[PDB]
A paper describes a structure:
We additionally determined cryo-EM reconstructions of wild-type SpCas9 bound to 18-nt complementary DNA targets in the presence of 1 mM and 10 mM Mg2+, representing the checkpoint and catalytically active states, respectively. The cryo-EM reconstruction obtained from a sample reconstituted in the presence of 10 mM Mg2+ reveals a catalytically active conformation in which both the TS and the NTS are cleaved at the expected positions. In contrast to previously reported structures of catalytically active Cas9 enzymes, the PAM-proximal part of the cleaved NTS remains bound in the RuvC active site. In this state, the REC2 domain is shifted away from the TS cleavage site, enabling the HNH domain to undergo a rotation of about 140° to engage the TS scissile phosphate with its active site and catalyse its hydrolysis via a one-metal-ion mechanism, in agreement with previous structural data. This rearrangement is facilitated by pronounced bending of the PAM-distal region of the guide RNA–TS DNA heteroduplex and a concomitant reorientation of the REC3 domain that preserves interactions with the heteroduplex. HNH domain rotation is brought about by restructuring of the L1 and L2 linkers, which results in the widening of the NTS binding cleft and exposure of the RuvC active site. The L1 linker, which is structurally disordered in the 18-nt match checkpoint complex, forms an α-helix and interacts with the minor groove of the guide RNA–TS DNA heteroduplex via multiple hydrogen-bonding interactions. The L2 linker helix becomes extended, allowing Phe916 to intercalate between NTS nucleobases by π–π stacking, thereby stabilizing the NTS in the RuvC active site. The NTS scissile phosphate is coordinated by two Mg2+ ions, its position consistent with a His983-dependent catalytic mechanism proposed by molecular dynamics simulations. Completion of the guide–target heteroduplex triggers conformational activation of the HNH nuclease domain, enabled by distortion of the guide–target heteroduplex, and complementary REC2 and REC3 domain rearrangements.
Cas9 is a CRISPR-associated endonuclease capable of RNA-guided, site-specific DNA cleavage. Cas9 enzymes rely on a dual guide RNA structure consisting of a CRISPR RNA (crRNA) guide and a trans-activating CRISPR RNA (tracrRNA) coactivator to cleave complementary DNA targets. Formation of a complete R-loop leads to the activation of the Cas9 HNH and RuvC nuclease domains to catalyse cleavage of the TS and non-target DNA strand (NTS), respectively. Here we report a series of cryo-electron microscopy structures of Streptococcus pyogenes Cas9 capturing the directional process of target DNA hybridization.
Numbering used by the authors: 2 to 1013, 1029 to 1051, 1057 to 1366
Write the structure that this text describes.
RNA sequence: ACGCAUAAAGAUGAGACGCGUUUUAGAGCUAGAAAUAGCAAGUUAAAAUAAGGCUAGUCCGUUAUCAACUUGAAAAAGUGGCACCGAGUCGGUGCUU
DNA sequence: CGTGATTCCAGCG
DNA sequence: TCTCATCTTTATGCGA
DNA sequence: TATTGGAATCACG
């Protein structure tokens, strides 16, 4: 019958809980201990923390699942090709495909000859000599005309199909449009054919070198214009050249068409704009544009390949052959030079695989970059290596055909090569002639992103709808899959429902109705004051309509200046007026109205409200679909209203994004006694002038009743089901469920009585208006100021709008002044999606995708950077540019440090020593959901008028309040001492929340969940000053010792005892720390495929691949260990010996074991096991052995420390002060006093060490490490107090709970002492802990046997 | 608690690239009895890329769930007095059952 | 000849 | 690494 | 608001 409160400190990887009473005292209770041990009752305090492994996001699972799908579909492509070829291959060589399938097997396991292709040694050797690589074969098949062996044709086609390339570029890059000079000559001839007055003569100009140079587009244009005698860059030929290279030219000046008619070949609107231009003049110039298109295709081909393609139809194969030949020549030259000049290193370079030489480059794991790093000093220290050095600096020395940078090759190249092979060989083999389209489709077919997995209802990820029930081959995908329905479901399965009407779907963000709702909602709360008016008055419905018609429907954005002058000064004839409710510009805007008015050029069509449904359907279609086919098909129904050009313009426009409200809410429902929708009320509410929130929360209005009727959907769900149904990442579910479970356990412990208050520490914050606005400035402002300070002209070259900067690649392009950050080059603005957003710190090392860890760079450069920080060479080359950007504030100091990390060593392990920025977001949303769940679950009873009775007030305390409470009353928190700080944080949150809701009841609306100089500054100052009643001496002001309730008589705070009570609570030794036992799930083992070795720790990669001959995985992950007491066979006679041991069922064996434990154990060797004496021990199972020493089971063969060091609060405060945590943030008097306190308490350090020492003599039992730490401490006694305190904070890692870790005390480094022996725990006391740790069951394992 | 505008950090799903690794194939030669030594060669390909499963799909297989005990196919339900004095991981005293 | 100390490693753009 | 899409939390600013 | 287990190798009483 004693009232109590529960304080919670939630985190991503920890949940601290505390129970307090009226006097802020944590109760102590006797809990019964179940089990067979003699211990039966234990006294425990109602405070503690729950520790669990962080909930992982589904990112890795999704990536692996997508990889699995891609592998399955690649094998299916190869299977389709084999099915096509099988009929003729059986005539040629029946077992060829069988040999290809079984090539992996060892000689004896093979059912055929070991040679896969030809089946005999001589032919295989001859083939390998004639075609050293596959690319030689591809080049030969493309170029040769004689009949080729069908096996070679299949090999080439299978190589092309298996590795087809990227699909980033749309359309078809005709390989025959390869020559640049010939197409340029054709363009010149076509230009001169109709323009004989001033013919263009470009003879003797090396067009290929000039246009296909590595310089920038503008530089190449200028070079070509200069080489053109008497031609103009802005001329018609100049504009055609600019279009061909990539620049978007203005054709208005060339023909004086009075319209710009800008033509960018990259844009898909190029064709329609060209049709417009033809309508301006005629089709006589069309051949010129066709020649320009061909020249552009040739230029792009040369850029992506950079090879002489004038003699072959397979430019990629020719490039690879040239690369192979140059590799061979350079290798021979390097061998000769090493033999002549540095013979003793020859064996190191060409034989030692362990090194990074050529032997390590080919046979070893050394990459191209590492090989260049190793070989450059040797190359420079020699003679006759000029060409080798030039190649090395160009990254074209001893290259491989299959490298990292092949990812920039479009699939059109392989498509053209495959088409050439088929055309060459179709006459000899008729089945190639009649199956050309089949194989080309196999190469080019790719499931649309909106269709997803092609399941038959057995997949939780599939959404496609099948028109006909049939197997989906790539050749009938168009006839079996309902693409329109699939795309509609793809969009709709992700978009959320309206909160007020959960059955309805939200409107598109750019929908006309949504924009009208936003504009009217913002406008209806505007007050105007003119001379002669006593008070501000709301805008009337007539005035609001006039404003909308005059200002919003004409100007894209309406500023207060226009409203004050265009309307009030002119229409209303008001000389002066003051406007309140809008700061500078109306946030809402009729953007869609202006876009559609420009598209259709019909004011009356949009103004009329009869066709409002038509516009809503138009915007819905433009939002749902992106493919022009589906959009055109949907808009066909409305084609009669508009015209053909208007229809094409509508097709071009594509909105994206969805709003937060439905159409049934904005304009669907109506008031019973008014017959006006919410939008109708917003347009003209009369003198009341209510807005949306007042409308749906008005009792006189009937909208609230309808919302209540529609919101009865959610009832009768279990807690697990409720958590699972929550939208968001599955990472936060673990934390939310654990918090709710510990709250329920605490309620159960206190005799089923609900807590009076539940105070939760929440990551909210309050900032001053200046700081808040300066961190919320639009990125356009940042890039504008950076460009202005940098002195660049990129903004004038390519003007941008703040909306367009939402695209990450464009934003990074502008942030980097348009130039690459890893090489001294210039990025192409139009041709994005060829560069990569590289994480400066590799994504495999640390999870950080902030703007301070992203750089837009060349794809090949990024991929060569690989799993590393940018190399020292890149840092040296680009440090000046990085500093220039840093001075212009285009990049932050953190980004500069990330870029120049290579100078300060490499990726040290300590770099992974800070909190991830993802953890803060996870904590925020975990706390939000926890508050919602607790408020909904605790308060269930409703009043007579259906009003919830707040029996359990949920308070959301901001972390700053508790942090200041700690920093003001010497309750300092040191995170490294132990895990008690979570429980202490929870207790302090409870205390502060209870005190604040006691002394200041009027603050309940601001702290209790439910009801609720700029405003931010006012709230910041208010929150800072609220906690002043805790202070004894303000600033000097001495408030009374015992704080009164205020307007009532209560003891809200008593500084004489309450501080003492809190100090006593924070120094309690017994705090219930629980490590949640988790069954390990995830990958079966390490993904690395180890080579063949005679070891039984290897796991076979297939059931028929014995690891003694094929290698395989190792290091399996143990799902949970199993305590088994049984009999094993010992000796040759195999006598039965009784043994008790842990087995460690791995993840891969978990299903087999759980299906039949006895048979599995007997297979493992143990005999006469007991199905009842088998004990399932998950990871982190707790065993108490002796002297209170606790070990947590980490696996079948390793233990973790399971004890917490209860350091007294005085030592913790001394460590916090001496270490200068957060430097010194006190007044000079207080800083001097604290420094004197530290100096007078030097001896504490010794005592602190003693503590740790004695702890390590009782629990840790690490003799060598403890002796090393003592020796280091004795060595560093003469150091200053600050360094010693910091290094002792480091030293506390020895006695922390969890897996042992290695630490550093000054210079000395102490490695981790691992307890790789689980023999002891077999004769210890296993402890099953409830989620709060209060309820325990102790099992004496020594009694088992 | 919510709607807009701006921003920062994140999340979820789909379609695709490029590598990497494993085993085999690409007859290594000579001197050697061998141990080995000298020389030549090196760039490519096939297959696998969680074992695997039944629902046989161009599907699914690494997120989420999980203290012990009792009842249960599961879902889920149930199981553990209090007060006070103290405190090195909780101990003691009284009451009560 | 088991056992404690030590070293090395971990699929990725 | 690329392409496409949809969500969340938090901060500031207007309005209840 | 955080954070290592598997495996091999070697000294050595
Ligand atoms: Mg916290
Ligand atoms: Mg498979
Ligand atoms: Mg990268
Ligand atoms: Mg905490």
């Amino acid at each position: 019958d004693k009232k109590y409160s529960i304080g919670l400190d939630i985190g991503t990887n920890s949940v601290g809980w505390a129970v307090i009473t009226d006097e802020y005292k944590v109760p102590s209770k006797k809990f019964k201990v179940l089990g067979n041990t003699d211990r039966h009752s234990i006294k425990k305090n109602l405070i503690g923390a729950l520790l669990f492994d962080s909930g992982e996001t589904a990112e890795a699972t999704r990536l692996k699942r997508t990889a699995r799908r891609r592998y399955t579909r690649r094998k299916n492509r190869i299977c389709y090709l084999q099915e096509i070829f099988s009929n003729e291959m059986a005539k040629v060589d029946d077992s060829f495909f069988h040999r290809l399938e079984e090539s992996f097997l060892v000689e004896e396991d093979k059912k055929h000859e070991r040679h896969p292709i030809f089946g005999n040694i001589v032919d295989e050797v001859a083939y390998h000599e004639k075609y050293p690589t596959i690319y030689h074969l591809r080049k030969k098949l493309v170029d040769s005309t004689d009949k080729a062996d069908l096996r070679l044709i299949y090999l080439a086609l299978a190589h092309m199909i298996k590795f087809r390339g990227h699909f980033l570029i749309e359309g078809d890059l005709n390989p025959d449009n390869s020559d640049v000079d010939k197409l340029f000559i054709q363009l010149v001839q076509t230009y001169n054919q109709l323009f004989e007055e001033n013919p263009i003569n470009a003879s003797g100009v090396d067009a290929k070198a000039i246009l296909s140079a590595r310089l920038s587009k503008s530089r190449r244009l200028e070079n070509l214009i200069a080489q053109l005698p008497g031609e103009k860059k802005n001329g018609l030929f100049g504009n055609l050249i600019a279009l061909s290279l990539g620049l978007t030219p203005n054709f208005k000046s060339n023909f004086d068409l009075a319209e710009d008619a800008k033509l960018q070949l990259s844009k898909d609107t190029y064709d329609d704009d060209l049709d417009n231009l033809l309508a301006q003049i005629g089709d006589q110039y069309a051949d010129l544009f066709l020649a320009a298109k061909n020249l552009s295709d040739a230029i792009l081909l040369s850029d992506i390949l950079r090879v002489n393609t004038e003699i072959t139809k397979a430019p990629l194969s020719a490039s690879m052959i040239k690369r192979y030949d140059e590799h061979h020549q350079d290798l021979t030259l390097l061998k000769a030079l090493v033999r002549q000049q540095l013979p003793e290193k020859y064996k190191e370079i060409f034989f030692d695989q362990s090194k990074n030489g050529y032997a390590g480059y080919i046979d070893g794991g050394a990459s191209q970059e590492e090989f260049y790093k190793f070989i450059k000093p040797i190359l420079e220290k020699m003679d006759g290596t000029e060409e080798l050095l030039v190649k090395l600096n160009r990254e074209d020395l001893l290259r491989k055909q299959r490298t990292f940078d092949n990812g920039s090759i479009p699939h059109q190249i392989h498509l053209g090569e495959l088409h050439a092979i088929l055309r060459r060989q179709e006459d000899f083999y008729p089945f190639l002639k009649d199956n050309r389209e089949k194989i080309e489709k196999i190469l080019t077919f790719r499931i649309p992103y909106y269709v997803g997995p092609l399941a038959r209802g057995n997949s939780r990820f599939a959404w496609m709808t099948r028109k006909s029930e049939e197997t989906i081959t790539p050749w009938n995908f168009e006839e079996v899959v309902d693409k329109g329905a699939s795309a509609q479901s793809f969009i709709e399965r992700m978009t959320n429902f309206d909160k007020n009407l959960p059955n309805e779907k939200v409107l598109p963000k750019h929908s006309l109705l949504y924009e009208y709702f936003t504009v009217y909602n913002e406008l209806t709360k505007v007050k105007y004051v003119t001379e002669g008016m006593r008070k501000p008055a709301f805008l009337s419905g007539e005035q609001k309509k006039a404003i909308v018609d005059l200002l919003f429907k004409t100007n894209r954005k309406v500023t207060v200046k226009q409203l004050k002058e265009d309307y009030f000064k002119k229409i209303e004839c008001f000389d002066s007026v003051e406007i309140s409710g809008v700061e500078d510009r109306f946030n809402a805007s009729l953007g869609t109205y202006h876009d559609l008015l420009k598209i259709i050029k019909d004011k009356d069509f949009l103004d009329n409200e009869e066709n409002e449904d038509i516009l809503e359907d138009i915007v819905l279609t433009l939002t749902l679909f992106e493919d022009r086919e589906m959009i055109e098909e949907r808009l066909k129904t409305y084609a009669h209203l508009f015209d053909d050009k208007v229809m094409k313009q509508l097709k071009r426009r594509r909105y994206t994004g969805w709003g937060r409200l439905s159409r049934k809410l904005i304009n669907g429902i109506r008031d019973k006694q008014s017959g006006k929708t919410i939008l109708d009320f917003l347009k003209s509410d009369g003198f009341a002038n209510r807005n949306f929130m007042q409308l749906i929360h008005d009792d006189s209005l009937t909208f609230k009743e309808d919302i209540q009727k529609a919101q009865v959907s959610g009832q009768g769900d279990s807690l697990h089901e409720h958590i699972a149904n929550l939208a968001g990442s599955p990472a936060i579910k673990k934390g939310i469920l654990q918090t709710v479970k510990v709250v329920d356990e605490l309620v159960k412990v206190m005799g089923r009585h609900k807590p009076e208050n539940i105070v939760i520490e929440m990551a909210r914050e309050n900032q001053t208006t200046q700081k808040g606005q300066k961190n919320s400035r639009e990125r356009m402002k940042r890039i504008e100021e950076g460009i202005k300070e940098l002195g660049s002209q990129i903004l004038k070259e390519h003007p941008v709008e703040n909306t367009q900067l939402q695209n990450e690649k464009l934003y990074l392009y502008y942030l980097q002044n348009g130039r690459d950050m890893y090489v001294d080059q210039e990025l192409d603005i139009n041709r994005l999606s060829d560069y990569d957003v590289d994480h400066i710190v590799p994504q495999s090392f640390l999870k950080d995708d902030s703007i301070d860890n992203k750089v837009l760079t060349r794809s090949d450069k990024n991929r060569g950077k690989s799993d590393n920080v940018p190399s020292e060479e890149v840092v040296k080359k680009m440090k000046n540019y990085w500093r220039q950007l840093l001075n212009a504030k285009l990049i932050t100091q953190r980004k500069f440090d990330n870029l120049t990390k290579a100078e300060r060593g490499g990726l040290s392990e300590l770099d992974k020593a800070g909190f991830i920025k993802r953890q803060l977001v996870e904590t925020r949303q975990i706390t939000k959901h926890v508050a919602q769940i607790l408020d909904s679950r605790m308060n269930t009873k409703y009043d007579e008028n259906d009003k919830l009775i707040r029996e359990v007030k949920v308070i959301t305390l901001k972390s700053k309040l508790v942090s200041d409470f700690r920093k003001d009353f010497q309750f300092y928190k040191v995170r490294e001492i132990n895990n008690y700080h979570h429980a202490h944080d929870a207790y302090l949150n409870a205390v502060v929340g209870t005190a604040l809701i006691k002394k200041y009841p009027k603050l309940e609306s601001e702290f209790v969940y439910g009801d609720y100089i700029g405003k931010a500054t006012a709230k910041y100052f208010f929150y800072s000053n609220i906690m002043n009643f805790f202070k004894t001496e303000i600033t000097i002001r001495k408030r009374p010792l015992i704080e009164t309730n205020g307007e009532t008589g209560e003891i809200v705070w008593d500084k004489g005892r309450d501080f003492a009570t809190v100090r006593k609570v924070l120094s309690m030794p017994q705090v219930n720390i629980v490590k949640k036992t988790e069954v390990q799930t995830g990958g079966f083992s390490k993904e690395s495929i180890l080579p063949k070795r005679n070891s039984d720790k290897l796991i076979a990669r297939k059931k028929d691949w014995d690891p003694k001959k094929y290698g395989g995985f190792d290091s399996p992950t143990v799902a949970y260990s199993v305590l088994v007491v049984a009999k094993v066979e010992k000796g040759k006679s195999k006598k039965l010996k009784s043994v008790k041991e842990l087995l460690g069922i791995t993840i891969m064996e978990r299903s087999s074991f759980e299906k039949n434990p006895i048979d599995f154990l007997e297979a493992k060797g143990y005999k006469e096991v007991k199905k009842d004496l088998i004990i399932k021990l998950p990871k982190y199972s707790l065993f108490e052995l002796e002297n209170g020493r606790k070990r947590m089971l980490a696996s079948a063969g390793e233990l973790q420390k399971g004890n917490e060091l209860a350091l007294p609060s005085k030592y913790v405060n001394f460590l916090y002060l001496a270490s200068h945590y957060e430097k010194l943030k006190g007044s000079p008097e207080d800083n001097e006093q604290k420094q004197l306190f530290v100096e007078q308490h030097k001896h504490y350090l010794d005592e602190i060490i003693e503590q740790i020492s004695e702890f390590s003599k009782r629990v840790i039992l690490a003799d060598a490490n403890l002796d090393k730490v003592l020796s280091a401490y004795n060595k560093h006694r003469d150091k200053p107090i600050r360094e010693q305190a910091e290094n002792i904070i480091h030293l506390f890692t020895l006695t922390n709970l969890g897996a042992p870790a290695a630490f550093k005390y000054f210079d000395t480094t102490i490695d981790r002492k691992r307890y790789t022996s689980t023999k002891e725990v077999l004769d210890a006391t296993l402890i099953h802990q409830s989620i709060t740790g209060l309820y325990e069951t102790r099992i004496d394992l020594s009694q088992l046997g």
